């Protein structure tokens, strides 16, 4: 009784003859690189990757964004060769490299990272947090234009929302200082939603800030179709994620069926869905910027529930499932004396009929 | 006249207690063994005597994964450096795919 394999056996391609004329793994990290290379392949037997919740990932995902701007890679490569050749000409750089003392201008590499490869990194961070999973039902994009939104609390500092930061709702008390590059022919729709925080509905989300037809960089001039409202994560619930979205529209499109009243303090009205909202405006606009941050409870959230929303604050708690015990035996053989205490409800003395 | 004497030791009852697909509560022993046969995978620990017990409530799954030893495990490291430049090892692993979420957020007070 045997059964043949359903495909190639793993160590079968090497030849068992002429073993001493083969190259061995002379190290441990060489084998480690080969084994972690091999563990990524789609094998035909049963593997760890099949069972442990990888969401059945192979299926192409729809891009909805701006195209990549065309660059001539030959000229770029020759100019970069020119630049590193000019840096390699200096000899004090060689002294700094040999002498283990040569730092990097972190702000310059920060702005350059924002300039060249940063959009793809922000795309994979936005997909790690599940933004594209809950904003567009899986449809992905790249945040082509950079964006800078900074929050205002005190006098000197800032608390910026980078991709994935943590800002407290006290620091999110007022509207932030939104800036980005734009030309004088473009209109923009700003949109700030919290992916979590809806109480009545599990899959909906709360619209907090919507500005439409931003004339380029004039962020103040847009029409306030939804007024700014601070975040409000509840107490016992965990971390809540707010996300800004910046779309670029070709022609100036107006909408009043999505517009809200001027207080807008009724939570049934702020029941948003970015999938349906992007479905309505599928052709006129396209997403171009993206920023998002974590938000947990502080003592100003009860102020938000008190004087703005006019409600009592709901608190939560992280409960666990009750512990597992077998069926209670009548004669528990060799169990300890505390076996009876696992099945008791109240640890106070009881007197039945007396 | 019976020069040999001594081999009267009984069987150890070792082997797999939970096969693939069996629901397993936390702390159930999955397999007893000597001289490692099934290796521990995700959410499976080992005892001193190489028994395999669950660490979560779930369903047992047996797979076959690549074997990379700890770098201080010197005998396995020399067995690794003695392999040719394409071979990998593929031992057998036991996982527990956990069933319950580790908690839920309930509404306790509305104040």
């Amino acid at each position: 009784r045997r059964t043949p394999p359903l495909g190639p056996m793993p160590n079968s391609d090497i030849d068992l003859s002429n073993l001493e004329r083969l190259e061995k793994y002379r190290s441990f990290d060489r084998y480690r690189r080969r084994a972690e290379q091999e563990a990524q392949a789609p094998h035909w037997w049963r593997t760890y990757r099949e069972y442990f919740g990888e969401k059945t990932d192979p299926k192409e995902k729809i891009d909805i964004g701006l195209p990549p701007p065309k660059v001539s890679r030959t000229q770029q490569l020759l100019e970069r060769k020119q630049a590193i050749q000019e840096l390699r000409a200096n000899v004090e750089e060689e002294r700094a490299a040999r002498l283990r003392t040569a730092s990097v201008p972190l702000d310059a590499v920060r702005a350059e990272w924002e300039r060249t490869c940063g959009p793809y990194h922000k795309q994979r961070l936005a997909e790690y947090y599940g933004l594209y999973r809950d904003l567009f039902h899986g449809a992905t994009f790249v945040p082509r234009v950079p964006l800078h939104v900074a929050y205002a609390v005190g006098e000197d500092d800032l608390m910026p929302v980078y991709c994935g930061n943590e800002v407290t709702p006290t620091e999110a008390a007022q509207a932030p200082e939104v800036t980005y590059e734009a030309e004088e022919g473009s209109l923009w729709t700003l949109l700030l939603t919290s992916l979590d925080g809806h109480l009545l509905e599990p899959d909906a989300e709360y619209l907090h800030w919507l500005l439409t037809n931003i004339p380029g960089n004039r962020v103040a001039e847009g029409q306030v179709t939804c007024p700014y409202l601070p975040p409000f994560p509840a107490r016992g619930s965990g971390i809540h994620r707010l996300a800004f979205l910046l779309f670029k529209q070709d022609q100036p499109i107006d909408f009043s069926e999505d517009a809200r009243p001027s207080p807008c303090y009724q939570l049934a009205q702020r029941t948003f869905r970015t999938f349906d909202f992007y479905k309505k405006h599928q052709e006129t606009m396209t997403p171009a910027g993206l920023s998002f941050f974590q938000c947990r409870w502080d003592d100003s959230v009860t102020y938000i529930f008190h004087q703005l929303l006019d409600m009592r604050e709901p608190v939560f708690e992280f409960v666990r499932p009750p512990p597992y015990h077998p069926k209670q035996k009548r004669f528990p053989h060799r169990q300890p004396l505390r076996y009876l205490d696992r099945y008791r409800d109240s640890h106070e003395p009881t007197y039945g009929i007396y | 006249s019976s020069k040999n004497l001594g081999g009267k030791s009984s069987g150890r009852r070792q082997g797999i207690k939970k096969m693939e697909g069996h629901y397993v509560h936390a702390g159930n022993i999955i397999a007893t063994q000597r001289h490692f046969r099934w290796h521990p995978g995700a959410h499976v620990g080992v005892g001193k005597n190489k028994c395999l017990y669950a660490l979560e409530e779930g369903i047992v799954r047996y797979t076959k994964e690549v074997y990379v030893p700890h770098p201080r495990n010197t005998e396995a490291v020399d067995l690794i450096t003695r392999l040719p430049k394409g071979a990998v090892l593929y031992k057998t692993f036991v996982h527990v795919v956990p069933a319950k979420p580790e908690g839920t957020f309930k509404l306790v007070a509305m104040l």
């Binding site: 009784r1 059964t3 043949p4 394999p5 037997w45 | 067995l79 392999l83 593929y90 031992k91």
Partner: peptide
Amino acid sequence: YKTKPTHGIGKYKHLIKA
């Protein structure tokens, strides 16, 4: 197992002659 299609997937001493 010995009757499964993946029998002998963990074979290694046919690679080391020493």
